[PDB]
């Protein structure tokens, strides 16, 4: 069971096939990708994202409040693909 | 204590990522489980870590210890 | 700096989320987010500043000191007292700090 996440990142696009058992940031840095990540336990914000499309399972994060999950941003560190999606990396600084 | 191991919390050692006890402080005294790993470098480089004990519990949780604070089993 | 702004709302939020708070004296706080920024935009993970390592490459692919580090994610205790529980002496009724109070301490 795996889903295609489309990422944006600043240098462009890339999509890769994350297991629904596997994290984003991790699946990410399997293709050879380089996003940013400093806990990697979703207590910061330094691996923030922002889902365009599709869903992501991130029960496992505590920084972000409810107004900013309601707003799309997610923590690629501790995020599980929920189906396909396309996430924006390198969206800490919209954040606040 | 090498990686594999099953220890025991033996030293009282409070925490506030549990799961169940979500920002709330809980001690994982009488817990057991196993050494998932012992932070000391990273690829030959030395780490400056000062909680190595890396030890997994049931299903999705896992806590840093010191030496003393665990046992062998 | 843009990554200061950064690491500045980072701890500003992080207090609020952990129910921490900021030492009396901001000017400690302060020093504390102009490291992490530093290290942040030195490395691309805001390392522990308070700290001394033979291997600052190492260490943030390590993640151990990686802000917030595991000694505060798992038992709120941050050596650099830049999160602190009410309960603590140092702990002051703060959460949040003036950019200029940060900028200040830029220029030293
Ligand atoms: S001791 Fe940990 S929580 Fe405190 S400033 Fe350093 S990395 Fe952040
Ligand atoms: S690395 Fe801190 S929330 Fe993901």
Redesign the pocket.
């Known amino acids: 069971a795996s889903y295609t996440v489309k990422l944006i990142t600043p240098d462009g696009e890339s999509s890769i096939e994350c297991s629904d058992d596997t994290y984003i940031l991790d699946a990410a840095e399997e293709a050879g990708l380089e996003l940013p990540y400093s806990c990697r336990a979703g207590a910061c914000s330094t691996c923030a994202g922002k889902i365009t499309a599709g869903s992501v399972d991130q029960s496992d994060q505590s920084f972000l409040d409810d107004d900013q999950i309601e707003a799309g941003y997610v923590l690629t560190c501790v995020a599980y693909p929920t189906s396909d999606c396309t996430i924006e990396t390198h969206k800490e600084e919209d954040l606040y | 204590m090498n990686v594999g191991d099953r220890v025991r919390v033996t030293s009282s050692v409070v925490v506030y990522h549990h799961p169940e006890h979500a920002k709330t402080a809980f001690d994982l005294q009488g817990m057991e489980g196993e050494v998932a790993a012992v932070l000391t470098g990273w690829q030959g480089r030395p780490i400056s870590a000062n909680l190595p004990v890396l030890v997994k519990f049931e299903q999705a949780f896992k806590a840093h210890f010191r030496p003393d604070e665990v046992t062998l089993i | 700096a843009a990554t200061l702004a950064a690491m500045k709302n980072f701890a500003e939020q992080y207090a609020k989320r952990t129910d921490t708070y900021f030492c009396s004296d901001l000017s400690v706080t302060a020093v504390?987010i102009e490291g992490?920024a530093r290290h942040k935009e030195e490395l691309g993970s805001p390392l522990?500043?308070?700290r001394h390592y033979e291997d600052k490459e190492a260490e943030v692919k390590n993640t151990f000191?990686?802000?917030?580090?595991v000694?505060?994610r798992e038992r709120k205790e941050?050596?650099?007292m830049?999160?602190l529980t009410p309960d603590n002496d140092f702990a002051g009724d703060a959460q949040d700090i003036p950019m200029e109070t940060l900028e200040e301490k830029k220029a030293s």
């Open positions: 504390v992490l522990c500043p308070c000191w990686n802000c917030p580090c000694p505060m941050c050596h650099c830049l999160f």
